[PDB]
Scaffold this active site. Structure first.
Site, PDB file in Angstrom:
ATOM      1  N   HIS A  38      35.052  46.027  34.971  1.00 46.18           N
ATOM      2  CA  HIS A  38      36.055  46.158  33.924  1.00 46.18           C
ATOM      3  C   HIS A  38      37.333  45.403  34.229  1.00 46.18           C
ATOM      4  CE1 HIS A  38      37.534  49.902  36.215  1.00 46.18           C
ATOM      5  NE2 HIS A  38      38.621  49.160  36.096  1.00 46.18           N
ATOM      6  N   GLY A 140      45.627  50.661  39.183  1.00 42.41           N
ATOM      7  CA  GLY A 140      45.409  49.658  40.192  1.00 42.41           C
ATOM      8  C   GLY A 140      44.549  50.085  41.365  1.00 42.41           C
ATOM      9  N   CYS A 142      41.438  50.956  41.304  1.00 42.66           N
ATOM     10  CA  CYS A 142      40.034  50.618  41.149  1.00 42.66           C
ATOM     11  C   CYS A 142      39.619  49.554  42.155  1.00 42.66           C
ATOM     12  CB  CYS A 142      39.753  50.144  39.731  1.00 42.66           C
ATOM     13  SG  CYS A 142      39.812  51.522  38.633  1.00 42.66           S
TER      14      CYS A 142
END
Ligand SMILES: *[C@H](O)[C@H](C[C@@H]1CCNC1=O)NC(=O)[C@H](CC(C)C)NC(=O)OC[C@](C)(O)c1cccc(Cl)c1
Ligand SMILES: *[C@H](O)[C@H](C[C@@H]1CCNC1=O)NC(=O)[C@H](CC(C)C)NC(=O)OC[C@](C)(O)c1cccc(Cl)c1
Ligand SMILES: [Cl-]
Lengths: 296, 297
Positions: A38, A140, A142
């Site tokens: 993503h 942030g 991820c």
């Protein structure tokens, strides 16, 4: 006795920054950077992305990968489940020995919480029975990873993707397969009813005895009888495999597993009367039997 | 919201094994100096009441085997500073981070990298209690493990581990070898003072709870002097105006005035928690600093 993470050095040298328009963290192993797919999404794309379509519109040059103060050049990309694999021109000279593993519910791991490709903290987590984790993850975060260290081998088991509406978290193994029923889309998603990891609570009760906390010992019970009690209090059922796994702690303490279950039955039915166990007013279920041995 | 340690990589590259006779423990290798606890020069018997100067005179540089992984370091000089030994070695540690030695204040937190035979096994966050103990997880051989904070890329070493007290808590020194607290590195009876709760940390954790959606305990107001009379009753550290100012960031992030948060805390202290929880804890947590709450939130 403490909630203790593995030393994180080996993983710190693998963390990089990955930006597409949207920045997150990647895991640089040999000549490959793994990150959540993503990253290729805009603010709008996240409601219901068509990832295949989205990735086609993207070129290698749309992928800004930074290892510290050095920018890495991407020379190839591919989608595996919910992860992106970005082949780069440089193999990571800091690559540790490593494996990818899909862990089981009830198992623990260390998380190296990262932002903008830089490590900020490390903490121990459990994979809940409903395949969520109770983390501390900001925007942030991820691409931060969870791992165990066995021997000198780093066993990567988790990559972080999302927060659910309960405030808990969900993510994938390093092949991009989600733990649980979740998908990387920003729509409503239910985690099952969670349960307490019974074998871990017993491991923690043994850790208590090992450390001098003994007031909760007593009575006895059978595996089938304890489980009828456990079901009432939303505890996972205890199998014989769990009893055998607790063997080592039983032998260190002279306390038979089913005797400890007897004590745990009393604690569930009668509560804690205001006393504590290893300084906690609640029962702790994110220590495995392995974790307790490793510590003591 | 969790107890969160700093990444330990920078400190991992400084850990070595220090052997003197039968005793082996951990040392900290920075530039061309290895720091370790001086009781490495003690035998089983010496530990009841060592004369460290006399014991150290019997030792020569070659009596000190320092191992950095599979690399042997040659000791070319030694010296005692307070309760630590400084071993000058032939090689500067190429992995030396930017670092400072600091003496932390009671109520401050730090990360501990627990080590055995110079190899890291785990990392966890600790608080320096008001009575200058820490509630750690240290086994035999863990001495010389260190505590630290990391700001930017600078490692601020604040603690080296020396002993467990008989109550099971732990004591050690700063990196200049000065104990935190009244403790001495000898195996005789030693009492830690009465401990107290770090009030400013509990308030900061209540702010973290509000930040995270946990609000049931909010309410009333109070005066600093009124709250402190309650604090004294419940073995809580007195709250000073410098503490109020330090909480300023969280007060501004949440719009809750510190003295209002104090009112809620008085109620929690007077009425207890009724079985409710706050950030999933059934007890009030006092080992997050305001800095810790911000860094996470
Ligand atoms: C990646 O760093 C980021 C980290 C999380 C956001 C804040 N706390 C986190 O742990 N993850 C995402 O941005 C992710 C992207 C999707 C999967 C394509 N979205 C997300 O986690 O949404 C969080 C939110 C707002 O709670 C939500 C809203 C609606 C539906 C869901 Cl399932 C989740
Ligand atoms: C160094 O690795 C080791 C670490 C402790 C051993 C068990 N848990 C620990 O944290 N430290 C020592 O062995 C230390 C050496 C002295 C200061 C010269 N001794 C010690 O920790 O004593 C612990 C004990 C046995 O509980 C004790 C007994 C009598 C009096 C005291 Cl103050 C302490
Ligand atoms: Cl608790």
């Amino acid at each position: 006795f403490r909630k203790m993470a593995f030393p994180s050095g080996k993983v710190e040298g693998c963390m990089v920054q990955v930006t597409c328009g949207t920045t997150l963290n990647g895991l640089w192993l040999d000549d490959v950077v793994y990150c959540p797919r993503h990253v290729i999404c805009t603010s709008e794309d996240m409601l219901n992305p068509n990832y295949e379509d989205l990735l086609i519109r993207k070129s290698n040059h749309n992928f800004l990968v930074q290892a510290g103060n050095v920018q890495l050049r991407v020379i190839g990309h591919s989608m595996q489940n919910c992860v992106l694999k970005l082949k780069v021109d440089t193999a990571n000279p800091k690559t540790p020995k490593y494996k990818f593993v899909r862990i089981q519910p009830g198992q623990t791991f260390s998380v190296l919480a990262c932002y903008n490709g830089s490590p900020s903290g490390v903490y121990q987590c459990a994979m809940r029975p409903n395949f969520t984790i109770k983390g501390s993850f900001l925007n942030g975060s991820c691409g931060s990873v969870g791992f165990n260290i066995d021997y000198d081998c780093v066993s990567f088991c988790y990559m972080h993707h999302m927060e659910l509406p309960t405030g808990v978290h969900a993510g994938t193994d390093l092949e991009g397969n989600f733990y649980g029923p979740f998908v990387d889309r920003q729509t409503a998603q239910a985690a099952g009813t969670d349960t307490t990891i019974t074998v871990n609570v017993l491991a923690w009760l043994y850790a208590a005895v090992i450390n001098g906390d003994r007031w909760f010992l007593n009575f006895t019970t059978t595996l089938n009888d304890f489980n009828l009690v456990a079901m009432k209090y939303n505890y996972e059922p205890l199998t014989q495999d769990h009893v055998d796994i607790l063997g080592p702690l039983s032998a260190q303490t002279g306390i038979a597993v089913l005797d400890m279950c007897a004590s745990l039955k009393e604690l569930l039915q009668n509560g804690m009367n205001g006393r504590t166990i290893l300084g906690s007013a609640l029962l702790e279920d994110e220590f495995t039997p392995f974790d307790v041995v490793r510590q003591c």
